[PDB]
Each structure stands twice: as C-alpha cells, then as structure tokens.
Design a protein around this ligand. Structure first.
Ligand SMILES: Nc1ncnc2c1ncn2[C@@H]1O[C@H](COP(=O)(O)OP(=O)(O)O)[C@@H](O)[C@H]1O
Ligand SMILES: Nc1ncnc2c1ncn2[C@@H]1O[C@H](COP(=O)(O)OP(=O)(O)O)[C@@H](O)[C@H]1O
Ligand SMILES: Nc1ncnc2c1ncn2[C@@H]1O[C@H](COP(=O)(O)OP(=O)(O)O)[C@@H](O)[C@H]1O
Ligand SMILES: Nc1ncnc2c1ncn2[C@@H]1O[C@H](COP(=O)(O)OP(=O)(O)O)[C@@H](O)[C@H]1O
Ligand SMILES: Nc1ncnc2c1ncn2[C@@H]1O[C@H](COP(=O)(O)OP(=O)(O)O)[C@@H](O)[C@H]1O
Ligand SMILES: [Mg+2]
Ligand SMILES: [Mg+2]
Ligand SMILES: [Mg+2]
Ligand SMILES: [Mg+2]
Ligand SMILES: [Mg+2]
Lengths: 267, 267, 267, 267, 267
C-alpha cells in the first residue's frame, strides 16, 4: 500500500510518493480536451473514468492552437465531471513507475474549499475503482483520502513556525496565514488571478493590499512554481524576511506544495 | 509660487493651501488601478506620470466590485512606483482651482520613515516635471520639498505643549509622543492596523498596551478621520484629558493633519 | 468551600489556596487575545465568560510575533471587559487541581483603586456564574469577595511592623507606606512604569525621588517578581535596612503578594 | 586659575566665584533626566560626562508633566552616577562666563557626610577631565577640592560667633550647632524633609523638637532659599534672637550658603 | 462639677481628680503627630479641637520610627496651637472614667511663665467648648482655671516648710526655691535639659552650679519621674538633707506634681 500526495493544479498536476528513503516525484501538464477520435496520436493518452473520455498528455495543447487562452481550468472547484481525470491519470502514472494498486491519497485543496470538496473526492473514490487508459483497463484501490491544504508543503522549509505562506499559483494565490503550525481561518485569503494571466510585479502588489495586516519584519514563505521570482518582487515592495522554499537536489520549485506534505503529514 | 501641504493617506489624499487669508482645502479618494482601456468613463480620470498609467478618481472603486479588500494601499511606504500618482494628481487638482504651476510641497510621512523617504520624494521631483492627465499634458514645478511628520497638524489645536498625538488613521496608528513642540524618537510608535480593518474599540485598546508609559492625566490629542470617535473610546479605557482636534467651519476631522501643518510650518 | 487569593497582574496571574496544611500555588501568563478561529491550537485555551471569547494560555504570545510590545495590559484598571477572563480562568485552573466550585475570593488591587474597583468585581460576580472553557461549560460560585491591597503579602516576611513595601511590579510600582500593620494613605505612591519597560537601576532611582521622606535606616520590604534584584539596586542608592521577602521551599519571589495574604488574611 | 564654590542642592545648583573685587554668581535648576533623543530642544542642554548622557537645563521639567513629584533628587548622597552632571555643568557655565579651565572647587556637603563623600568627589575629579556639552567637547582641570559644610556661608552674616545655623533647604534641614567658629558634632542635626514637601510652619515646629537644647535667647541664623520666611515662623514658635542672613545687592537668599563661603574660606 | 489637676508635661500628661475620699489618677504619653489618614489604627485616638487634627495615644510613637528624637515637645511654652490637644484629651479621659462635663482646671506651668500663659489657657477655654474624639463629638465646660506652679505638689510631702523643690523633669529642671510655703522669685531657676537628653549624674551636677547659694544642710525635695534616682545622685554631690517625695500606695513618683496640688490647693 503506497501513500502518495497528488497536488492537482491548473498548469500542471504534481504527484509525490516515497518508495525507498528517497522521494520519487513527477508531474504532467493539466490540459485535457474532449475525445474527438483521432487517427494516430503520439504524445497524449486517452483516459476513461466514470463516463468520461478525455485526452491527457503533453500534446493536448495542439487542440488549442489559435485559442491558447482556453487550455487551462480557471479557478474552478477541483474534482468536477472534468477534474477527476487529472487525478486518476496521476494514479496511473504512479502505477507505471512502481506497480502499486492500493493508494492512500493525500489530496491538496484551497483552504476555503476544505469541507466543501468532500462531496466530489470522497463519494467517487471508495476503493476498487477502474480506469481505461489507452484501451488497457486498470483497476486501483483508494480506501482513505486525507484532504490537506494547498500551501502547507512549504512549512517544512520555513525557519519560523509563525509565518505567511504565499502560494504563487497559476490561476490563484493562496495566502495562508499561519500561527503555530496551525492555519488561521480569518486571515487566510484566496486571491484570484495567477502567474499565467498576471505578471508577478502586478501580482505581488495585490498581495500587499489584501494581506496588509502584516508588518515588514514578519516571515513570508513563497511557494509555487514562480516562488524564486515571487520573493524577488516582494522585496521591492518592502518585505524583509521573505524566503522562498527550496527543495533538495534536482527538484524544482513547483514540487514544494507536494513534497513538503509528504515530509510532514500522512501518518 | 504656491506653498501647499499634501497629506497622502490610504483612504484618501488631502491637500491644503492658502491663497487668500482663508484656507482652501479638498481631497480625493486614494484608490487607483492599472490602465485597462475602457470605453467611456465618467467619474475617474487617467493619470500618466513617469512611465505609469493609472486611473484616479471617485469611480475607480467600481474596478474592485467583488474584491473590495483590494482597493486600499496597505501600510506601504508612500511614494512607490504607484504612490507618486496620488501626489501628482493632487498637484493637478490644485491647478484646476488656482492656476499655479510652481509648488512648495509640504509632504507628510510617518516619523519612522522620515529620513528614508528622501530616495523617492526628492529624486523624482526636481522641478519642470510633466503629467498627462486625461490626454491634456500638464507641466508643473517643485523646487523644494519639506517632509513633515504625520500628526503634527493636530499640535496647533492642542491646549498643552506637552502631549501625545494619536493619529487614528486608516491602515496605521501614528502615536507621536511630544515634549516641547518636539518629537521624542524613542516613545513614538507606529501601530499597524487602522480604522478600516479594525474597530475603534479594538484599536483604542491596543493604544493602551503600547503607549503604557502614559498616566491617565496626560494630554492626548486625537487626530485623523475617526478622531471624535477615537476620544469617545479612549475615555472608556480610562484616559481623562483627551481632546480631539477640531478645525474651523465646514472642515471635518480628516483635514487636521493637513490644515494644521499649514498654520504652523512652511516658512 | 475553598478560600483562595488571586493576584491578577500584568505579566502573570498568580493564584494561591490552602487545601492541606501546605499551600498549593500556581500561575499562568497574563497574555490574552481576541478569538480568531484557529485550526488546531495546543498550548492555549479558549475562555468564554459574559459575552467574551478570548484565548488564555502559554502560546497566546505567538499572536504577537512582530509586535511584542502589544501583549501586556498596561497599568489599566483590573477587571475590565477584558480583565475578567484572567480571573475566571484562574478559577478554572483551581478546579482542575481540587474540584472546588465554591470560592471565597481574596482579590488584590492597588491601594489607590481600592474603593473604585467594586463596580466591576462585585457586580459581575454574585455566585452561580458560568464559564465555557475549551467547549466544556463550567459552573462556579463566588459569594464573598475580599479586595485586599497589592503588596500586603510581603508584610508577613517583614522583621519590622513599621516599614515600606516596594512592589517591583511589571507595569507599575506600588510603594505602600505602612505604620503599625496599617497602610498610610497620604504616603502610599503608585509609580507608573515597571520592570518590563524600565531597568531596575533606572526604576530604583525613581523610588528614591518619590518616597524621599524616608531616611536610610528605615525598613524597606521589596516584593514582586524582581524582588531580589530590587534590593541589590536599592543598596547602591544608599538604603541600609532593605530586605526582600523570601518564601518557603520551591516558591519563587513572584508569589509573595499572593502567598503572604493567605497566611495573614481571609478570616 | 579660578577658585569657585559650587553648592549642589536639590532644587537648584548654585555656583559662586570671584573674578574682580565683585562676586559674580548664578545658578541653574537641579532637574535632570535620561537622554531620550529628541527632535529640537530649546531650553535644555545635553551633558555627557563619564559614561552618562543627561539633559540639564530649564525645560527638563517638561519631561515630568503629570509626574511632577519625580523631578527632584531626594536627600540622596550628592555625587552619584547621576549627581556628577550637576557639578560638571556648573563648571561649564562658569567657562561660558569667564573662559577659565583650571578650577579650585569649594564643594558643599552636609556635615554628617563630610568624610564619606571623598570616595566620589575626589576620585572622579583629578584634573584634565573632559565633558561633552551640546556636542562641543570641553576640557577642564580640577587639582584640589575643599569639601566645606552646608551652612557655613551664613556665618559671615552672623552678629554672634556662637550661634545655630538653620539651613531651610529643599529636601532636608541642616541644623549646624556652632560654638566658636567651629562646628559641634554631637549637636548638629540633619532633619529630613524640606520646603518642597513640607510647609515652613510644619517645618519650623520640627526644628523646635529636635534642637530643644536651645534656650530662646540663643542666636539662630536662618539660611537657605526660604530664609526670610523661616525666621518669621520661628518667632511664632518663641525664639527671640533669630536673624536670617541677608546678602548684598541683587543677590537673593538662596546664595547665602555659597557666597558666604567665598567670603570666608578657600585660602 | 469636678475639680481636677492636669500636669501637662513633655514625656507624659498626668491628670488627677478626687471623686470619693480616694484620689483617682492616670496619665497618657505626650506624643502627638499630624493627621495623615490611616487605614485601621488600634492604640491611638484622633482628637479634633479648634481647627486641629492630631493623633494622641500609645502608638503615636510608631510614626517616629527612625526619627525618635522628634517625638517630644522640647521646652516649648505649653498651650500652643499643638499643646491644647494634650489638655482636651485629658478632659476626655476623665469623662471616660466618671461622666463629668463641668471641670475646674488646676493647670501646672513653670513659675517663670506664670503670668505669660494666660493668653493661651484662658482665652481658648471659656466653657461650653467641644472636641471631636474618634468621630464622636464631646462637649465639656471649664469656667475657672487656677494656674499653679510646676513643683508645688511635692510640698505636701516635705518635712520642712523651708526647702528647695527640684523638679527632675524630662526636658527641663524646675528648681523652685521656697521660704514659708511661698515661692521666692529671684532664686527659682528653670534649668534647660531634662532626663531624656541628659543623664542624671550630669544633670544633678548642673544643679550644684546654678543653685549654689545653698549650703549642704538645707532641705531639698526631689520630685518628677526620676525623683528617687535624683536624690541618689545629689547625695554623691554632697547634699545631706535631701528627700524625694513619696506618694501613697500604687502611685509612682511621676504623679507627685499632680497629686500633691490636689491635696493642697483648689479651694
Ligand atoms: N512540469 C513542469 N515543467 C516545467 N515547469 C513547470 C512544471 N510545472 C510547473 N511549472 C512551473 O510552475 C508554474 C506553475 O506553478 P504551479 O505551482 O505548478 O501551478 P499550480 O498551483 O497550478 O500547480 C509555471 O509557470 C511553470 O513555470
Ligand atoms: N473624503 C472623505 N469623505 C468622507 N469621509 C472621509 C473622507 N476621507 C476620510 N474620511 C474618513 O476618514 C477615515 C480614514 O481616515 P484618514 O485619516 O482619512 O486615513 P488616512 O490616514 O489614510 O488619510 C475613513 O474611515 C472615513 O470615514
Ligand atoms: N509564571 C511565571 N513563571 C516564571 N517567572 C515568572 C512568572 N510570573 C512572574 N515571573 C517573574 O516575575 C516577574 C514579573 O513580576 P510580577 O510580580 O509577576 O509582575 P506583576 O506585578 O505584573 O504580577 C517576571 O520578570 C518574571 O521573571
Ligand atoms: N534659581 C532659583 N530661582 C528662584 N528661586 C530659587 C532658585 N533656587 C532656589 N530657589 C528658592 O530656594 C528654595 C530651595 O532652597 P535651596 O536652598 O535652593 O534648596 P537646596 O538646598 O536643594 O539648594 C526654593 O523653594 C526656591 O524658592
Ligand atoms: N505614663 C508613664 N509611664 C511610665 N513612666 C513614666 C510615665 N510618665 C512619666 N514617667 C517617668 O517619668 C519620667 C519623666 O518625668 P516627668 O515628670 O513625667 O516629665 P514631665 O515633667 O515632662 O512630666 C520618664 O523618664 C519616665 O520614666
Ligand atoms: Mg499548486
Ligand atoms: Mg493620514
Ligand atoms: Mg503584581
Ligand atoms: Mg543647599
Ligand atoms: Mg512635669
């Protein structure tokens, strides 16, 4: 039984798991399109789960040639009748690396939609499910789902236990105000707009307007894919003790929300 | 040559000047947004200064409809690559009332950032500058800048020369401990949080914790926009000789930091 | 029915009671903050009494990370709409040690506010009250309140019956000039400023200015948390017969105002 | 080389010196406070001597607005780590009137602390010292110190050589029983309490209790700042040959302890 | 109407009266202090008479702890604006023993101040006066005052009608040279200094210098509180027929000046 953490995003979908003492990690881009029976596709794979028939892979962006603003799920309630495909293809990708068919899912979600997502993640996933990927059917088992918060993976790489975790996402910012290893509910934002639509210098300045109950000596931990460019544009705003979370060797900044939850949670 | 005082705040930006024996005064709200070329705007005006293109006016708050916690600059180092627009539009508003193009600026700033702000206010303003407001270009001249302290305008309306000036601001409190017409540097706070985010009864009680070297018979001069509600919630704490600064006729309490510096300084 | 003495201070809140022939004693830090619903707190506890909702405990100081000068009630009229929580949580802490729900309160207060505090301590506490601590409701009974003076606990450890009790507090000094086991009202000071804000060498020298009707052979009994450092800095001023009050075994110097009133009063 | 006499008191500090045949005299108030870097002070001056940093001047009483019982050194062993500043600023004030940098100090002290004060006055003052007053450093030289008694200046204005000198001070009475131009050690009091705290009618009556080995025809010479009001309240007690010491023209009664020692001693 | 004799001294105040054939007698110590509102005094009582507010009683000496040379009125003109309180409290003490409110006062005074004291004893006491002792007001009546001499009480216990009465007092000696039951005015001394300040062996030797017109076979009657130690130190000087006056049973030597005037005068 393999306990893994799958950070379903909008630009990409990051999965992390621990087989040996090392952490094996990977991702795949979060662009999927309806079926449209094609002649001979190469860099995409057909996924069928629960009455759906979608292409997930690298070359699904070829379906959106002159309409490239339509290839990204925008700030929309992860785990729809379209967002399940990103999760069950992430389960298949782990199976192509290990051979495990019994999963303990550590899902990530924004903190505002914490108790809301249990309609869609829990009921559709009760063990002994089955996908049909590239014709070949695949059966897996998920018998417990631990729905974490999107941002807490950067807390392991925080020098202070009392900080603000800024998730410089792709369609949304997840400001997560944290006290003692615990998340304050009143002071945690979810700012719309991400690094795809907006520049970081125009996105770090909207952080300084929303979370303006923060003096400039307060610790800020930047995470997300644009983390090391986020802290270079917050220091020009005037914050001082900001530090982006850096992972180990050969793991870039967009695995921080996923790798750090593996190093902390899932007991 | 017109000597004027411009109190750049976070909720609003107050300007005061003296043409006749009277003091002509006014303000405009401190909400500005990036350009976004619009069809036909009515209650806002486009301002271009130094590679910037921002809307300043009454109806800029319509850009922040479902996101009203993003319309206010929060406690952030006045005179950025965004806060210059509030000053040069305040210069334009004076020009629409008098016709003066040579200014002597009496700027206000918090006392903690007194010697720090001279990188941004002095270097960008050296006379013969030019804005482009609503298409029509406008040229002005500023050849001396007197950077005052944010709160000293209430000192003219203080019965005692030895008092504490509490600036019940909008994003910050500027407690300014004063001895003999001079500002003590050790005992002057700058408390984060203002009347927008916090209630006054929860904000006057944080004044009693910080500036607790003050016995209850010591004079406190409340200024700012919420001044006459500030002194009604300090007397419930236990202070006795507190008195908010009242201006003349038809000038409300939020001009005290600006009008009082005109009646005292700028020689 | 348990007769106990609760010395509500500013740095801490000390409670003392007598169950066996020994005196069981304890305290908890006097830092409390508004509610702000948190995810999973560990070293703090929620207290609800009379329309209030506050966290009292060890880790409430984490709410005041970059603003550590805001965590202490400063010289402010004990028993407010915020200071009742320190008393009713002290009643709960005794209940977790004995199981008593009927209390005889020996409260301490400064001598200047002796007859003044009966608006707030008497009327809010008339027996059969109820707190809600950590969800679990708790009912107690207080049917008599003996409001003592803050400093008289050191009188039991005084070799002379005619002395000056110097309460080296945390926000205030309570100089209590005493004749024959009775408190002189004209010669009892209440000096603002304590050991948190001021150093003791700069605080013992303000004692020598105020209470300067004292010749150097007159007995001075130092109490408070900084008592044994208070007498080492009064002897450098020039006082000779000064002696800090020492308790029994395993009771430090900050219980003197509370333990000594149990050994003397509450009949 | 200028031989001068400096009567360090508690209300004021009187210096006297003789340049021409006349006596040039002056004083400055004895209120000093710790440093607290201020913006623009007017009637006070910064004094730095031997690791100290104090304000001495007229307007130092503005630091003690609601706490006016804290501005006076009370009966405390002249020449501390705070009382040296009153002496070295008195040396600076003479230098601003003459230009002398080599001093022969005639210090005054109470007779009880005659041989005791030589730890603090002699060792800290051995010539070639240096103060830093108002930024500008000042070097002086003191190579002999003649420690007189506080009261003997009134002996020159005494018609009898066998009298009692009553020093109606500010924090203390220096009754100095004198026989033949020499001071009796057994019959010289030092009564605590002065004219600041106590009224003279309640202070002259404590003289009649202590020095009650004095019949009513015995000469009493009243000195100090309240001298001519002291003799008007001793005659109501019943003393008959009491006469306050009057100086020359335009020198009030509080220079008697300082001017009279210049006219008698310092050989 | 009760005729009583009240010997106001400096160490104590002795009153004597005759209700039955016996003489009821008593005293109280002559230490009084200004008011200073105290919390709960035990062994002292508040006395208010004629705009005065003083504590008279046993424990008033606690007000003079480190200053014990200030608790005694020294040789100062009995019946001041402070010495009236000792008399009217002596009237109250008689009222607590009998219930009499109409007094015939036999006051004692030194012989030198015989005709002088009638300004203060007669005018302030004209019947129907009123004290306020311990809150409870008390009205009395004094309609004749017989001002005796301090020492004549020992004349009843003198074997010779031609003697010298030596009053070994507390602040003064009242040598009273007596011929035929009548007092010689030229040869009656009043020597300053008493048994408090001076030893008797150093006080009996000053008697031998002043009243040196006395041969050693001449009768000397020692009275006062130190009477039986006075005659033991006059016999070492060389006087032979000296005999201290001894009262009846359970009346010590300090009632002789008061009891003996009751047995002789007041007709
Ligand atoms: N598989 C990947 N390969 C390269 N860059 C990536 C990858 N995944 C994410 N990134 C970088 O991360 C940014 C997106 O941030 P990310 O945290 O992945 O968004 P989300 O919150 O949707 O996961 C992109 O701009 C991209 O530069
Ligand atoms: N132009 C205005 N019209 C009405 N109310 C105002 C105006 N400007 C300020 N106020 C009042 O003042 C408060 C803001 O305080 P203010 O001192 O103006 O903030 P700042 O320190 O940013 O200038 C607001 O809550 C508002 O009630
Ligand atoms: N619970 C505690 N644990 C350890 N030290 C304490 C505690 N409470 C007080 N002290 C000591 O006492 C000092 C504060 O003095 P205290 O008399 O408690 O202040 P207050 O007058 O506000 O009660 C602190 O500096 C601290 O060293
Ligand atoms: N510089 C001064 N100006 C006016 N009055 C003074 C001055 N110095 C002293 N006095 C008077 O003298 C009194 C204090 O007595 P003084 O002998 O100066 O005290 P100290 O013994 O401390 O020197 C004060 O009540 C004041 O009236
Ligand atoms: N009430 C008293 N109790 C005990 N001893 C007393 C009392 N009154 C006087 N004495 C003794 O008398 C002495 C004082 O002499 P006294 O004649 O009382 O003085 P005065 O002339 O002032 O009355 C004291 O030394 C004391 O020993
Ligand atoms: Mg993400
Ligand atoms: Mg403002
Ligand atoms: Mg305390
Ligand atoms: Mg003096
Ligand atoms: Mg007598």
């Amino acid at each position: 039984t393999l306990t893994t953490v799958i950070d379903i995003g909008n630009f990409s979908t990051k999965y992390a798991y621990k087989d040996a003492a090392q952490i094996k990690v990977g991702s795949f881009p979060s662009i999927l399109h309806s079926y449209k029976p094609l002649e001979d596709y190469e860099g995409m794979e057909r996924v069928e789960y629960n009455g759906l028939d979608y292409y997930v892979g690298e070359t699904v962006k070829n379906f959106y040639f002159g309409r490239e603003e339509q290839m990204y799920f925008g700030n929309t309630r992860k785990g729809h009748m379209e967002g399940q495909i990103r999760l069950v293809y992430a389960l298949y990708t782990i199976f192509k690396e290990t051979g495990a068919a019994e999963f303990n899912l550590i899902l990530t979600c924004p903190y505002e939609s914490m108790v809301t997502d249990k309609k869609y993640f829990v009921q559709h996933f009760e063990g002994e499910r089955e996908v049909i990927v590239e014709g070949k059917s695949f059966k897996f088992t998920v018998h417990n789902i631990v729905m974490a918060a999107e941002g807490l993976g950067a807390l392991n790489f925080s020098d202070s236990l009392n900080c603000v975790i800024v998730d410089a996402g792709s369609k949304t910012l997840n400001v997560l105000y944290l006290i003692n290893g615990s998340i304050s509910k009143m002071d945690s934002h979810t700012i719309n707009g991400g690094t795809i639509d907006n520049s970081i210098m125009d996105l770090a300045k909207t952080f300084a307007k929303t979370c303006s109950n923060i003096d400039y000596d307060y610790p800020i931990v930047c995470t997300g894919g644009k983390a090391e460019e986020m802290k270079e544009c917050l220091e020009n705003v005037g914050y001082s003790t900001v530090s982006s979370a850096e992972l180990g060797e050969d793991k870039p900044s967009y695995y921080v929300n996923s790798v750090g939850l593996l190093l902390k949670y899932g007991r």
